[PDB]
Design a protein around this ligand. Structure first.
Ligand SMILES: Nc1nc2c(ncn2[C@@H]2O[C@H](COP(=O)(O)OP(=O)(O)NP(=O)(O)O)[C@@H](O)[C@H]2O)c(=O)[nH]1
Ligand SMILES: [Mg+2]
Ligand SMILES: [Zn+2]
Lengths: 113, 104, 308, 50
């Protein structure tokens, strides 16, 4: 036994877009790492095809952080809506282990075909 | 959490580094010079492998320093009333000075 | 009864010798790398429900090759069936055999592996990283079995020492090629696992000493071309070995073969920046951390450690 | 010597390692032999190649 992810973390919708100011508003579904030293976003599930720059205002509100959404990962899901053609973007510079946790939790609780 | 922070994670976890340092200094008191060491440890833990022992330094020296620690250069004492068997090439004696007891 | 032995051998080499008792399991003492949700460590646990049979070579002597049939769980049975079906065409995957034999009133499922080696790689890594001359029987057996030495070498007391008996390195270095092969096959394993769309965590006790891999019981599926292997305990625990056994000595030969002359580098060439990257890309391809051949480009001290 | 010029001018940059300058330019070799057994496999006869 070497188990990938024993219990996982949560998700919230966040803002993202193509370029620096193209981040309009909530257009993503982001899994995040809730560490005591701040929340670290893990992954971005999107229904738009080409995003490259996501954003979230820092906890004090004065500052905001930008994340480069590196090239996506196609898949489709099962829902009452039917096929959901979605793309998985990871923050650029994601270690393999975090990709593993994201994909494990997704495939465990999100239906794929 | 030790295995977690050791292999899984990638950056510092100064909370857990502080925690481990506290555990160590609470169960593994130490005294150092240039390679001449003395270690006072809780024993009802080292007998269960919860802290270091004298075989563990042998194993570590073996696979990392690439030498064999012959068990005739490292000693081990059990009655602290007599101090270390040898430190800095001086033996320790508990004698009566004035009214109290001192180590020379 | 006995037809169990007839089912296990299947199609290949029915020279079975029971190494257990009957159809009952065989308790052992092996080095695992458990981390589930309640226990971590790198310590010797005890048996994964394995019945083991040893294959007879010709002339009825015993040879190092085993058929380790497990007895664990129908859901895991079908799960492993699917992953193996996806993962079979790789050369670095050891041929499973999923069957269903009846003991009393239950078609209990089995996973009868094929042509294994008595000791995995985790046993070598453990027994060499946790050395204790008081009981180093496992190291003795692993050394003698692969023609590195002979039992008469172990009567020369103080054989393990490095200061005296400096020849012991020549005994250890002869374990070189095998470890190299493991690395190579492991690389290919990762490739298959990525190209099939599989999420999996790699361990050292999932590898017979030949190089093969087995028992993907804790894997999951994704879309093809988007798999991920997690190699961070595997490589890191294995690192202190590739200098005891000089694992890369077969890289100064003309075509990386032990029966060739040495590559004669030019006298004045000093850069050696592309050779390092080629070696990294061949041996450590999924070490997902930038490796700078020259440390002048490093970011902080920890990256300097990681590149030195 | 001129051999130093010949060995440096052929470097891709002009920086040659230090442990190859005496190797390919020194005009005199010094051997030290501990015993005759090593003498026989190194410096036997009036001429030898190193
Ligand atoms: N090489 C070898 N290993 C054996 C033998 N008998 C038992 N084992 C043990 O059986 C293990 C097989 O791996 P196993 O635990 O079944 O699967 P796993 O990949 O390690 N983890 P999981 O059970 O989650 O799939 C080996 O690593 C070894 O520790 C034997 O004869 N030879
Ligand atoms: Mg098992
Ligand atoms: Zn670096």
């Amino acid at each position: 036994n070497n188990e990938l992810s024993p219990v996982a973390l949560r998700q919230m919708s966040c803002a993202a877009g193509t370029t620096q100011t193209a981040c309009t508003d909530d257009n993503a579904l982001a899994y995040y790492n809730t560490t005591k030293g701040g929340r670290f976003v893990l992954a971005l599930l999107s229904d738009l095809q080409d995003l490259k720059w996501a954003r979230f205002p820092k906890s004090d509100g004065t500052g905001t952080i930008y994340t480069e959404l590196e090239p996506p990962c196609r898949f489709v899901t099962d829902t009452p809506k039917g096929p959901k053609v979605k793309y998985l973007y990871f923050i650029k510079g994601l270690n393999n282990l975090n990709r593993g946790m994201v994909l494990g939790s997704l495939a465990a609780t999100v239906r794929l075909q | 959490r030790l295995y977690e922070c050791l292999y899984r994670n990638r950056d510092v976890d100064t909370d857990f580094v502080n925690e481990f340092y506290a555990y160590l200094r609470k169960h593994f008191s130490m005294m150092i010079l240039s390679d001449d060491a003395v270690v006072c440890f809780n024993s009802t833990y080292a007998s269960q492998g919860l802290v270091a022992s004298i075989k563990n330094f042998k194993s570590v020296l073996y696979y990392q320093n690439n030498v064999f620690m012959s068990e005739a250069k490292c000693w081990t004492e059990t009655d602290l009333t007599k101090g270390p068997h040898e430190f800095c090439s001086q033996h320790t004696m508990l004698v009566k000075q004035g009214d109290d007891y001192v180590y020379l | 009864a006995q037809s169990f032995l007839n089912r296990v051998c299947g199609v290949s080499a029915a020279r079975l010798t029971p190494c257990g008792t009957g159809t009952s399991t065989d308790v052992v003492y092996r080095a695992f790398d458990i981390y589930n949700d309640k226990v971590a460590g790198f310590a010797k646990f005890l048996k994964t429900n394995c019945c083991r049979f040893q294959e007879k070579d010709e002339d009825d002597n015993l040879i190092d090759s085993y058929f380790v049939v497990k007895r664990h769980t129908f859901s895991n049975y079908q799960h492993e069936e699917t992953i193996y079906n996806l993962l079979k065409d790789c050369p670095a995957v050891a041929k499973h055999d999923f069957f269903k034999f009846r003991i009393d009133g239950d078609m209990v499922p089995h996973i009868s592996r094929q042509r294994l080696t008595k000791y995995t790689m985790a046993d070598l890594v453990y027994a060499l990283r946790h050395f204790d001359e008081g009981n180093c029987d496992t190291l003795k057996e692993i050394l003698v079995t692969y023609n590195c030495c002979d039992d008469d070498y172990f009567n020369k007391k103080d054989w393990y020492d490095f200061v005296e008996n400096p020849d012991i390195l020549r005994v250890y270095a002869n374990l070189g090629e095998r470890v190299r092969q493991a690395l190579l096959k492991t690389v290919q394993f990762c490739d298959a696992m990525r190209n099939a769309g599989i999420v999996g965590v790699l361990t050292l006790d999932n590898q017979d000493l030949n190089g093969n891999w087995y028992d993907f019981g804790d894997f999951i599926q994704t879309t093809p071309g988007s798999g991920v292997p997690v190699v961070d305990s595997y490589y890191s625990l294995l690192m202190p070995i590739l200098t005891l056994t000089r694992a890369l000595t077969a890289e100064s030969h003309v075509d990386t073969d032990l029966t060739k002359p040495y590559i004669k580098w030019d006298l004045l060439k000093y850069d050696f920046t592309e050779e390092r990257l080629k070696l990294f890309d061949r041996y450590f391809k999924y070490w997902d951390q930038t490796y700078h051949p020259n440390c002048v480009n490093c970011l902080d001290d920890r990256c300097i450690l990681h590149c030195a | 010597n001129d051999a130093l010029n010949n060995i440096i001018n052929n470097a891709r940059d002009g920086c040659v390692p230090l442990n190859i300058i005496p190797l390919t330019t020194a005009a005199k070799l010094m051997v030290v032999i501990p015993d005759y057994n090593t003498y026989k496999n190194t410096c036997d006869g009036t001429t030898f190649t190193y």
